[PDB]
Each structure stands twice: as C-alpha cells, then as structure tokens.
Amino acid sequence: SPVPEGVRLADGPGHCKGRVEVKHQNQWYTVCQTGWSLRAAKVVCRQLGCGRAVLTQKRCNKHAYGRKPIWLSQMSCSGREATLQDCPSGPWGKNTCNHDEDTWVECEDPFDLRLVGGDNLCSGRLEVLHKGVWGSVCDDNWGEKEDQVVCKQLGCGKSLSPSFRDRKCYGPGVGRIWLDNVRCSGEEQSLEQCQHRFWGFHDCTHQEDVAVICSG
C-alpha cells in the first residue's frame, strides 16, 4: 500500500485550511475515510506545523469538480501518535467513501512574538501574534521567571534586570491586551505553554504594559 509522502491541504485559504490531499506515490488524490475524528486532523495539522486542529467536516459535492480519485485504505490514528507513517492502515480493499463528500480540516495560525520600540531588538514592548493580530501582554503579574522565558525564545540572552527606570522609553500600546495573569514557572519552550487567563479577557489598560529588556 502507498505510504503518504505528505499532505498539502489544497483548495483552501492558505495552507492551514482546505481539503485533505494525501500525496500518493507520483500523482496524489483526495481521501474521504469514514470515522474521520479530530485525532487524524491533529496529525494532519502536525504534518504541516500550523498548530492545533479546530474543526473537521464533510461537505456536500455540488459541482465541486472532485477530479482527484479517492484512496482505498483507512487511516485509524490515535492522534497522540507520530506522523501518518506510524498509524495502522487497512490492507487495501474497497473504499468506505459511500457518499461523495470532500474531507475538510481547519488548523490554527502558528504562534509568534517580538519586541517593538527597543533599539537593535532584544528590548521594548511585547507583542504576541494570535488570530492574525498583534497585541500587548498585561503587567499585573510579571515576575523575573516570566522575563527569562521570552528572552531565550528569541535568543537575546539572559535578562539583566533593568527595573522600571528604563522601561519608560517604549510607552504604551494600542492593540488588544491578548494575555493577562501570565504565570510561567518552568523554562518550557514558549509563552503559550504557561498558564494564562484567556485570549481577549483582561482587566488592564494600555498604560500598564509589559517591557522586557534582555542582555542582547
């Protein structure tokens, strides 16, 4: 049986949304396996690295030009397993695609962060990308532990504890306060891996923002 070389998610806005297109040896075709739970969508999203699977559904075919043939094996995958290579597949046989429907999948935008307002980077206001928008992080709880996690992710070195005397050189923000009550205990790898309140809910003002100055 063919081994998937990759997934591309064509016919969708960007490459984190669209129709599931398994790369068959040489020419590739669309797949409509039954029991398409979110577990397989999570592995599909992890193939591209977009982020977390949010939704999967099969859409009615009304002159959608589904020229791509269909596969002949199932892909029962536990979701916590590795790439599509390491999940069992049926021994060829017939297809489970009775109703002619395309499989849809909706991944999420990847995370990103930066410092704005500081010279030669490694300093300034904190902006985090989510839902395709940048925003500020509240300073209600900003311990020294929460400062070093941001610094190493951008490779700016250990923070030098600049206090608030030089934190007035960046000013306030205008964007939405995405994060609040951030509590980072361990190093982890990303700020999103910490415990926060929620995306979009806060009790802060643009005057109270977070400024992080690393070594550089």
């Binding site: 739970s37 979110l38 977390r52 949010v54 939704l55 999967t56 559904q57 209600d140 709880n141 608030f164 007035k168 309140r197 929620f198 809910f201 005057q207 109270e208």
Partner: protein
Amino acid sequence: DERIVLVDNKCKCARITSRIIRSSEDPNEDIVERNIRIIVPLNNRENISDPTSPLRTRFVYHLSDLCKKCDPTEVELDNQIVTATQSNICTETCYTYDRNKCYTAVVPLVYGGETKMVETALTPDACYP
C-alpha cells in the same frame, strides 16, 4: 495544603476556602467547612477616586455575586473545539484599593496667576509612571 482557595477578591478583600475533615471513621459523617475572611476599611470613603466624597459606614457582601465564574472555557467534543459559558448570571463597587493597580487624579495648581492641572497619586506608592 489541606485548603483550596475558591475566590480571592481584592476590592472587597474577600477570601473563601473549603476543606473536608475526616471526622470519626464513617465516610458518610464527614463535615464540609466554609471559611470567609473579610477585612473592612474604616478610613476609606464612598468613591475611592474622589477625595471629596463623604465617608462610608455601610458594607454589603453578597456571596452569590462573589463565587461566580464569567470566562468561556474550551470543551473537546471529538469533532471540534467550542467555547462554553460557565454561568448565565454574568458596576461593582471597589471598597479597598488594589496593589496591582494605579489610582490618579486631576488637581488645579495656581502659581503667579497661571493654573496648571497636574496628575496626582492618591495612593501612597502603588506603581510608578
């Protein structure tokens, strides 16, 4: 370690903890305890952002509006991810000040005739500009 914090309000300085004590040995005869700790200010006034407001000598503490959850949570349904409303009940008065917050005011300053309004710090230290 044996107590779990339910609410940690700062405006009303209210804190509620619950704990189960293994009294006797029958599992059906263990008491459930609810502790409430309230600190009331005797010098703060009606409006904490206006020094001219009169003094406050009446405090009301509703426990139904204190132990309330108002933040959508994520729920997995094996086919999608949705946001769920915790409560349907969701202008509250702040009795005391908050350390994590800054309180400022506008005051007229006269000198040589000209009047320059300047931002003040009602709180002793709080945060810095």
